[model samples]
Target: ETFTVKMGADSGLFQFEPANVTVHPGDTVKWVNNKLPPHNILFDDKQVPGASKELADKLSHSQLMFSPGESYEITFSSDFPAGTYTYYCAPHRGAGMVGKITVE
Candidate 1:
């Protein structure tokens, strides 16, 4: 399965369309910067366990940071245990620009 999450307009604002999601293992989730700069997704370290560490280490902050029309994709494979994963945009995390992926 595949899903798309979009970042809202304005470079300094915090908004995520849909904001939440549910998926199974082996699914793909894509986040697109619909109209913003300096936006990157970071999974909460403690909340997501191993997955968060993997993502943080493998993807440079610049890799996840998206300009207008750019996107990032992640596939939740069997290696990721079944649970709820929380994430947010680094620059806007304080503004509550957050989302979740539930893997079942």
Candidate 2:
């Protein structure tokens, strides 16, 4: 579950190398920042169905930023309830820095 997400080389795009990952409930995802431009890991609120608004409200709280050459890890503290959790990069989400973590 130790995932590696690399920042764009010179294009400034946030590219999650694997693009998709699968993990157990208690697994851990480690994002190793390997690019110059800093990036952030964030949940995509708009994609959360009816909870979008609520999730959006919690966005600022869940947002985690990473500096260049740094690393961040998030443990799947709870079961993902047998679904896919879509995530993205704050600074690069729009440019296709999005990915998914499928929990089984």
Candidate 3:
């Protein structure tokens, strides 16, 4: 299955639409940033083992998006196991712009 999470949404602010999600293994999640100019998804490895490193090496931090319509995608496989994956925007984490995904 596939899920879409909108960043900033119509609010055009530091927030994620549907800040929480639940899915099974082998599902795909896409984050669409249609209202935020600069945003990036940083999965917390400390909370969700290997997610940070996996994304860091795969997408790189320098690639943080600044385009309003840009999007990012990631698949949750068995490698991620079954748990809660919390993520946030680097520049807006302190602003409480965070989201969570639970894999069951």
Which prediction has the highest lDDT against the true structure?
A: 3
* Model 3, span 15-86: residue lDDT tens: 877899998989988888777657777765465645556644453233477777787777888776677777
- Candidate 2 has an lDDT of 0.62
lDDT of each: 0.73, 0.62, 0.75
Of candidate 2, the 10-residue stretch with the lowest lDDT total is 55-64
Q: Which 10-residue window in model 1 sums to the lowest lDDT?
A: 55-64
Q: lDDT-based ranking, best first?
A: 3, 1, 2
lDDT of 2 by residue, 41-72 (tens): 66656554344656434532244445666766
Would you give me the overall lDDT of model 3? 0.75
TM-score of each predicted structure versus truth: 0.78, 0.66, 0.81
Q: Write the per-residue lDDT of candidate 1 for residues 1-104, one digit (tens) a residue.
A: 98988886445456877688899899988888886556787664565746567654543233455567787888888977778877777777777888888888
Cα shift from native, residue 41, model 1 (Å): 0.6
lDDT of 1 at 71: 78
Q: At residue 76, what lDDT does model 1 achieve? A: 87
